[PDB]
Amino acid sequence: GITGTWYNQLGSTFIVTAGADGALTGTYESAVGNAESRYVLTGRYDSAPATDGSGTALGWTVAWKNNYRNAHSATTWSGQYVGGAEARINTQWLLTSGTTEANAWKSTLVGHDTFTKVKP
Amino acid sequence: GITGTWYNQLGSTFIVTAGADGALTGTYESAVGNAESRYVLTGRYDSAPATDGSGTALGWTVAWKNNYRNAHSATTWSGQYVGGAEARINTQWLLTSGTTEANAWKSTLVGHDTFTKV
C-alpha cells in the first residue's frame, strides 16, 4: 500500500500514512535544495480506486519551513500509486517560491519524481 | 489572511482555514469536471513568510472522491497568497487521474487558477 517509507530518484525520503478515508499525512526530507531534516506533509488520495488495473490518484504538499530553516516556498506532487511487486509512486511536481509580483513569472519550478520503497 | 472563502475564474469555491502550524484545511467545490458538492482539501503554507514584498507560498490537494462521487483523480495547486485589500491566491495546478500503465502518458492535466477572496 501507500503507507510506508518511500525514496525518490534524488534520495529524498517520503514517510507517509494513508488514512482509510483519503488522508495522506507524513514527513518529507529533501536530498536537494534549501532544506534540512524533515518537513510536514499533508495530502489526499483516492481511497476507492477503480478495479480495472488503474493506478491510485494522489497528491501532497510540503511547505519548506521547519524548526531549522524556512525557504519561503512550497512543493506539490501530483501523481499515482501503482501497486505490485515493485510498487511505485509516479509524480510531477510544482515548486512555488514567494516572489514579488514583478518576479511572479519565475516563481514556479516543475519536475518529476519517481518513488519506490527501495532504500538507496 | 488566507483563512476565508475564495472563488476562481471558473466559478469554483475554496473555503479554507490556515492554522498557526502551517496547516491548510477546508473544502473545495469545482464548477467544472467530474465533480459535485464539496470535497476535502488539505495543504500547507509558509507560516512565517518574508516581509519584503513577497507573496506567501502555499499548496493544497483535493482528491476528487466525496460521499457522492468518485472521479479517480486528484488536483494539487501550488502558488502564493498576495495579501492586503484585494487579496489573491495565484496558482498553477496539476490534475492526475488514475490510469493503466499504457495510458499513463495522458494521466496529468496542467493549468492555472486565480482565486479572489470574498
Add this chain to the structure above:
Amino acid sequence: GITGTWYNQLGSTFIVTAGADGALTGTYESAVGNAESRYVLTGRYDSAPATDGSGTALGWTVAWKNNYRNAHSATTWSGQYVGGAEARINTQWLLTSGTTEANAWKSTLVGHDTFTKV
C-alpha cells in the same frame, strides 16, 4: 489569423508568420529575464483546425541565444489561437536552462502567457 504582431501581459513582443504548411516563424522580444533584443522563434500550428468553435492548437520555441546575448536556456509555448475580433493566443510555457546533472531538478520553470494581437 495567427500572422501578425502580438504582446503578452509582461510586455513581451511576438512577431510571427504562419505558413500554409503549418510553419510558424518570427522573432520574440522578452520584457523579462536574461534577454535583450530579438530572438528567433520557430514552431508549428494546426493548419486545418476544427470549425466547431475550438481554438487552433499551436506551439513555438525560442532558444535564448542571439547575436547579443546567450542565457543558455530555451522556452516552449504550447497553446491555442482563438480568432475573430479580439484575437488571443492562450499559452502555457516551459523554460529549461542548461544545468549540471546535480542541478537538473531545478532546470525548468513553468508559467502561462496570454497574447493579444495588435
Add this chain to the structure above:
Amino acid sequence: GITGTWYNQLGSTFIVTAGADGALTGTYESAVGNAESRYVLTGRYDSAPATDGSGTALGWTVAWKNNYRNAHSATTWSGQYVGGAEARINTQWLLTSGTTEANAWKSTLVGHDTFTKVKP
C-alpha cells in the same frame, strides 16, 4: 551531438538535424495517441552551450497534422541535451488540444520524456 535518431521511453522516434546556428528540424513518430507515421517538427537549441559541464538547452514543437491524420493538437518539448558515452535528451512536454473556451481548463496535458539513441 543532437543530430541523429532518438527514441523515448514509449518507443516514439525523433529524427532531428541540429543546424549550426541553433535550428532543430526533423520528424517525430509517436508510439501513442492519435497519431500515425511521421510529423514535422521544428525547434531551437543553444548553439554555444556553457563550458562548465552543463547540458544544452533546447525545445521543439509538433503539430499533430500530417497527410494521414489531424488530431487538432500540438506538443512542445522543453529540456536539455546531455552528451557523453550515453547521450540523453531529458524533457518535459505540454500537449495542447484545440478546445472551446469553456473547455480550455482541460486543454493541456503535461508529462516527461527521456530520449536516447538506443533503438528498442
